[PDB]
UniProtKB/Swiss-Prot annotation, chains A, B:
Induction: Increased levels during neuronal differentiation. Belongs to the APP family. It comes from Homo sapiens. This is Amyloid-beta precursor protein. Expressed in the brain and in cerebrospinal fluid (at protein level). Expressed in all fetal tissues examined with highest levels in brain, kidney, heart and spleen. Weak expression in liver. In adult brain, highest expression found in the frontal lobe of the cortex and in the anterior perisylvian cortex-opercular gyri. Moderate expression in the cerebellar cortex, the posterior perisylvian cortex-opercular gyri and the temporal associated cortex. Weak expression found in the striate, extra-striate and motor cortices. Expressed in cerebrospinal fluid, and plasma. The chain holds residues 287 to 342 of 770 of the full protein. Functions as a cell surface receptor and performs physiological functions on the surface of neurons relevant to neurite growth, neuronal adhesion and axonogenesis. Interaction between APP molecules on neighboring cells promotes synaptogenesis. Involved in cell mobility and transcription regulation through protein-protein interactions. Can promote transcription activation through binding to APBB1-KAT5 and inhibits Notch signaling through interaction with Numb. Couples to apoptosis-inducing pathways such as those mediated by G(o) and JIP. Inhibits G(o) alpha ATPase activity. Amyloid-beta peptides are lipophilic metal chelators with metal-reducing activity. Bind transient metals such as copper, zinc and iron. In vitro, can reduce Cu(2+) and Fe(3+) to Cu(+) and Fe(2+), respectively. Amyloid-beta peptides bind to lipoproteins and apolipoproteins E and J in the CSF and to HDL particles in plasma, inhibiting metal-catalyzed oxidation of lipoproteins. Promotes both tau aggregation and TPK II-mediated phosphorylation. Interaction with overexpressed HADH2 leads to oxidative stress and neurotoxicity. Also binds GPC1 in lipid rafts. It is found in: Cell membrane; Membrane; Perikaryon; Cell projection, Growth cone. Chelation of metal ions, notably copper, iron and zinc, can induce histidine-bridging between amyloid-beta molecules resulting in amyloid-beta-metal aggregates. The affinity for copper is much higher than for other transient metals and is increased under acidic conditions. Extracellular zinc-binding increases binding of heparin to APP and inhibits collagen-binding. Binds, via its C-terminus, to the PID domain of several cytoplasmic proteins, including APBB family members, the APBA family, MAPK8IP1, SHC1 and, NUMB and DAB1. Binding to DAB1 inhibits its serine phosphorylation. Interacts (via NPXY motif) with DAB2 (via PID domain); the interaction is impaired by tyrosine phosphorylation of the NPXY motif. Also interacts with GPCR-like protein BPP, APPBP1, IB1, KNS2 (via its TPR domains), APPBP2 (via BaSS) and DDB1. In vitro, it binds MAPT via the MT-binding domains. Associates with microtubules in the presence of ATP and in a kinesin-dependent manner. Disulfide bonds join 5-55, 14-38, 30-51. The transmembrane helix undergoes a conformation change and unravels partially when bound to PSEN1, facilitating cleavage by PSEN1. The basolateral sorting signal (BaSS) is required for sorting of membrane proteins to the basolateral surface of epithelial cells. Proteolytically processed under normal cellular conditions. Cleavage either by alpha-secretase, beta-secretase or theta-secretase leads to generation and extracellular release of soluble APP peptides, S-APP-alpha and S-APP-beta, and the retention of corresponding membrane-anchored C-terminal fragments, C80, C83 and C99. Subsequent processing of C80 and C83 by gamma-secretase yields P3 peptides. This is the major secretory pathway and is non-amyloidogenic. The gene is APP. It is linked to Alzheimer disease 1: A form of Alzheimer disease, a neurodegenerative disorder characterized by progressive dementia, loss of cognitive abilities, and deposition of fibrillar amyloid proteins as intraneuronal neurofibrillary tangles, extracellular amyloid plaques and vascular amyloid deposits. The major constituents of these plaques are neurotoxic amyloid-beta protein 40 and amyloid-beta protein 42, that are produced by the proteolysis of the transmembrane APP protein. The modification Sulfotyrosine is found at residue 50.
Length: 56, 56
């Protein structure tokens, strides 16, 4: 909730290129990023609508 | 140090446009952002040197 929506997008150390969504506080909406497959944080949603459901 | 350095740059709810620096995890260095004068978070420095001291 709210709090997790403000961490920066974190690709993490793995090598996959998984399209995920994070809430962007500057833009005021969710934006895409490539997630590596491991590590990273809570501001990482499978789809844009999910990201918006939780953060938007 | 470290933990504060992963929050996004936050302008906050106040009305100013003040030049500040934040650590960007993707680029792995400090970058400029505009601060509104109140609120926001701790990833907010008056200089690049200071930002890099804490987060670099």
């Amino acid at each position: 909730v709210r709090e997790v929506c403000s961490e920066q997008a974190e690709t993490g150390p793995c090598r996959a290129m998984i399209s995920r969504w994070y809430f962007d506080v500057t833009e005021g909406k969710c934006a895409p990023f490539f997630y590596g497959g491991c590590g990273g944080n809570r501001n990482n949603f499978d789809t844009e609508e999910y990201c918006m459901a939780v953060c938007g």
